[PDB]
């Protein structure tokens, strides 16, 4: 050999699902997380760039068999099924199986006796140790199984489910991200699982990986990384997404303006925009100066997109577009919705955004905008206030 093939191809290909913070999370076309760092470190060690190849729990083992990637990670537990189709590295994290519940329900689910009752709505992700644990150790509970992380935690906050039993490190993170939730005794779990890297059936390759991984464990680098990634400002994702979507919508603004011969810059509608933003943002307890800086940057980024598209259409001598939505009617509602999302997310994240020491993490969290492909200058101006 596998090493031979990786050398000859010039890339380490790494399968991951990118929906399991803090191991592996997709921000745009970017992946970030503890397992992403590990992959990039192993690649560097092997003398090649890394390529992250997205996959999903249902196609994980198939994609692996189809040769879509060399190794797989992303908070992958050692299970017997996965063992039958490859080798695992040595484990780099031993983690507990423990509950996360609405905080007011914490005392109701501290024992497996309480949990394993006919009344209990237990949700879990499919195909791994959590589902095996739930079916085995809480069979008297009503069990539902979901492929999407967001859905499980939303279900628990919103009262559609009662608890999840999952890795302790997830309970720790989600307790922070979803303040209505509490991990239940995560340091003293019901059982343990081992996180490892899924490797091909190549004993020599495994020896190289194991040698590298054990050095990183012994040196404290893995523990250091776990701690940083658990502390990472994952709650910035809605703010990144609102910025990115607002900016991508400027393509539609530009199409509509081109058709009716409207100037790009409209300092009147700009005043209305900043004014409504300052009003709503002030009700959220955000300082007016924060708000004005951020939205002035968003408006300028938008015009930069518009001007670049007009510049292309001018040279190409483009006519009218039939794929052009109504500006005042349907685009500006969307813009207003995204403005609200951006303000609410700023408010949720105000401590992180106020901490100079976090700038590097904030950069990592926010820099991956799809809109960059559309305009690198616009992307930089949108992110400049942060
Ligand atoms: O006319 C427009 O609608 C768009 C949107 C914009 C904004 O992003 O809010 C507001 C006013 C205009 O100057 C620019 C930026 O074009
Ligand atoms: O791999 C498993 O065994 C799992 O069940 C762990 C898990 C936890 C949360 C999201 C995805 C996978």
192: Cβ contacts below 8 Å, ≥ 6 apart: 94, 95, 96, 97
Structure tokens that stand for 291 in this block: 């708000």
The CA angle 355-361-365, to the nearest 5 degrees, is 115
- Residue 149 CA, closest ligand 2 atom number: 10
Cα-Cα end-to-end distance for the chain = 47
Q: Name the CATH superfamily for 96-192.
A: Periplasmic binding protein-like II (3.40.190.10)
- The alpha carbon of 113 and the centre of ligand 1 are apart by a number of angstroms equal to 58
- Whole-number Å distance, alpha carbon 269 to ligand 1 midpoint, is 7
Q: Tell me how far apart the alpha carbons of residues 75 and 99 are, in angstroms, rounded to a whole number.
A: 17
Distant-in-sequence contacts of 172-179, Cβ < 8 A, 24+ apart: 172/230, 173/21, 173/22, 173/230, 173/234, 174/100, 175/100, 176/235, 177/21, 177/153, 177/234, 177/235, 178/153
Ligand 2 proximal residues by C-beta, below 6 Å:
20, 75, 77, 125, 128-130, 149, 166-167, 170
Provide, for the chain, the percentages of residues in helix, strand and coil under a 3-state DSSP scheme, each rounded to the nearest 5. Answer: 55, 15, 30
**CATH superfamily entry for domain 234-383:** Chorismate mutase (1.20.59.10)
Helix segments in 232-353, DSSP class H: 237-248, 250-260, 267-283, 288-316, 332-348, 350-353
Distance CA 386, CA 378 (A): 14
**Ligand nearest to C-alpha 167:** 2
Report how this structure was experimentally obtained. Answer: X-ray
Measured distance CA(22)–CA(226) in Å, rounded = 8
Q: Are strands 71-72 and 12-16 parallel, antiparallel or unpaired?
A: parallel
Closest ligand to C-alpha of residue 96 is: 2
**Residues with a CB atom less than 6 Å from ligand 1:** 253, 265-266, 269-270, 273, 299, 302-303, 335
SS3 category, 13? strand
- Please tell me the distance between residue 90's alpha carbon and the centre of ligand 2 in angstroms: 18
Find out if CATH 3.40.190.10 is the number for domain 3-92+196-231: yes
Resolution in A: 1.9
The tokens for 82 are 């996965």
Helices (H), 159-202: 168-177
Phi-psi category of residue 295: left, alpha or beta, with phi > 0 → left and psi -120 to 50 → alpha: alpha
- 233: nearest Cα among 338, 337, 345, 95: 345
Best residue among 16, 149, 166 to mutate for probing ligand 2's pocket (most ligand atoms within 8 Å of CB) is 166
Half-sphere exposure of 351 (CA within 13 A, CB side): 4
Q: 313: exposed, middle or buried (C-beta count within 10 Å: 0-12, 13-18, 19+)?
A: middle
- Residue by residue, DSSP assigns 82-150 as HHTTSEEPPPSEEEEEEEEEEGGGGGGGSSHHHHSSTT-EEEE-SSSHHHHHHHHH-TTSEEEE-S-HH
Which residues face 191 on adjacent strands?
97
Q: Give the residue among 148, 361, 66, 71 at the shortest CA–CA distance from 235.
A: 361
Q: What are phi and psi of 213, to 5 degrees?
A: -65, -40
Query: Do the first three CATH levels of 96-192 and 234-383 match, i.e. the same topology?
Result: no
For the chain, the structural domain boundaries read 3-92+196-231, 96-192, 234-383
């Amino acid at each position: 050999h596998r090493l031979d093939d990786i050398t000859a191809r010039g890339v380490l290909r790494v399968g991951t699902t990118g929906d399991y913070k803090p191991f592996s999370s997709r921000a745009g076309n970017d992946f970030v997380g503890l397992d992403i760092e590990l992959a990039a470190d192993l690649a560097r060690t092997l003398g090649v760039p890394v390529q992250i190849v997205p996959t999903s729990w249902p196609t994980l083992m198939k994609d692996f068999g189809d040769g879509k990637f060399d190794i797989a990670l992303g908070g992958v537990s050692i299970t017997p099924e996965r063992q039958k189709q490859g080798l695992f590295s040595v484990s780099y994290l031993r983690d507990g199986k423990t509950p996360i519940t609405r905080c007011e329900n914490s005392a109701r689910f501290q024992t497996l006796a309480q949990i394993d009752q006919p009344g209990v709505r237990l949700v879990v992700n499919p195909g791994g140790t959590n589902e095996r644990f739930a079916r085995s150790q809480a069979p008297n509970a009503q069990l539902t199984v979901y492929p999407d992380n967001v859905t499980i935690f939303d279900q628990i906050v919103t009262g559609a489910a009662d608890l999840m039993i999952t890795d302790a490190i997830e309970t720790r993170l989600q307790q922070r991200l979803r303040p209505q939730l509490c991990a239940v005794h995560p340091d003293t779990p019901f059982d343990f699982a081992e996180k490892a890297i899924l490797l091909p059936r190549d004993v020599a390759f495994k020896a190289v990986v194991d040698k590298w991984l054990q050095q990183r464990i012994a040196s404290g680098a893995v523990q250091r990384s776990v701690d940083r990634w658990l502390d990472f400002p994952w709650g910035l994702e809605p703010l990144r997404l609102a910025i990115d979507q607002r900016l991508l919508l400027a393509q539609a603004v530009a199409r509509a303006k081109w058709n009716v011969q409207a100037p790009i810059e409209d300092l009147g509608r700009e005043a209305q925009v900043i004014q409504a933003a300052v009003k709503e943002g002030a009700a959220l307890g955000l300082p007016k100066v924060w708000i004005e800086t951020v939205f002035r940057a968003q408006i300028e980024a938008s015009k930069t997109v518009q001007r670049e598209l007009f510049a292309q259409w001018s040279a190409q001598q483009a006519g009218k577009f039939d794929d052009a939505p109504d500006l005042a009617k349907t685009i500006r509602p969307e813009l207003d919705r995204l403005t609200t999302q951006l303000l609410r997310s700023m408010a949720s994240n105000q401590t992180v955004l106020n901490d100079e020491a976090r700038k590097a993490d904030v950069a990592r969290a926010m820099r991956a905008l799809e809109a960059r492909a559309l305009s690198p200058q616009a992307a930089t101006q949108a992110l400049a206030p942060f």
